[PDB]
Design a binder for this molecule. Structure first.
Ligand code: IMI
Lengths: 120, 114, 111, 111
């Protein structure tokens, strides 16, 4: 279900493997910002969701440092997986950059990403 | 300065180990209230007195309990004698499509070594 | 371009009046009053027009002890829309304040 | 209660008037107009009073092409406070929309 290759509305590709113990591992490649190539993704999911047709809660993080670039920032996505003919993951994200004390009021961006198993 | 025990303003206790290549692993917490954490951090931060960007996730499921939800914390570690982690968090619960609009809470937490 | 009737994704109807001094007044449809501000002198370079508004969910008939604020921008053009993120806060006791605030997003269109 | 002069943790000054059926009006300060709403009939059980307001960062001297909304609750008591979370959106292009909005939190007191 969650395991597979996902794309957000921006071209980004996230390759995610769901483990049997609630672990989420994989790789992100962003189509925007200060990023190049692949970045390590790690997260957790609810490995035994409700019966009742509710979604599957999950979250993951990417720190935007790899061997090519370092953006001194990290993003966390929080959302739910919803099965169906068109499986989708709906998330909200927080992106925090490292700042000095004086600039911390403006260190965090917030947005929403919708992931699909079909590239837009 | 990150590896160790951190406490938030709620009493809760977080034990985190920060690996050499940017992994964060540990637990949030008796057994029944203990949960797994996994995250990532900037292992090569700037020198300019900037904070170290990081983030982590906890799904609220263990062997004993399952709240069908996950929290992510996004934030930065600040050093010194008043070492702190300042974060904002998102908590999402699994919902039906009908109730998705109220699936996510937002808030902030501050973690201290004491 | 902002003044008029707007519809978000779950059919709610917002009637918005943009005043020349930057004020936004109108109603969200039971029916509640809205009030906000917008940039009454945006850039002409394709940038959007920044805005925000608030609805407290109390009227003559019902009270939910909560308020929502929408923060976003207007984008004009053939398919004008207002893209927003929102925060919904409910009155809670001090000990439930951690769970007093929801976050989401809303898109408004003219049809 | 809510009417008065409020200061946030960074020292900015908000002068707020609470109107009879839930209007918030006032200024933030370099001085800008604020507008919002609040629950004029809060719960008696000890809960806080839900509210929100907006400031568009345009006045007669400067315009940053951006707007902030605060969502939160007023807590009466020893330290009357207003605990909020805020969103600041800047007018951007289509291409830069994904990075248009910052989020944070603010505590206000009369001290
Ligand atoms: N796929 C996505 N890319 C952007 C959003 C949220 S994370 C962001 C990319 C940031 C890359 C590093 C940076 O620019 O600081 N979703």
């Amino acid at each position: 279900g969650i395991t597979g290759t996902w794309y957000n509305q921006l071209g980004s590709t996230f390759i995610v493997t769901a483990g049997a113990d609630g672990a989420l591992t994989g790789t992100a490649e962003s189509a925007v910002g200060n990023a190049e190539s692949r970045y390590v993704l790690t997260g957790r999911y609810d490995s035994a969701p409700a019966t009742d047709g509710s979604g599957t809660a999950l979250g993951w993080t990417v720190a935007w440092k790899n061997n090519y670039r370092n953006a001194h920032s990290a993003t966390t996505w929080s959302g739910q997986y919803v099965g169906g003919a068109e499986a989708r993951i709906n998330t909200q994200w927080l992106l925090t950059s490292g700042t000095t004390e004086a600039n911390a009021w403006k260190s965090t961006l917030v947005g929403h990403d919708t992931f699909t198993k079909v590239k837009p």
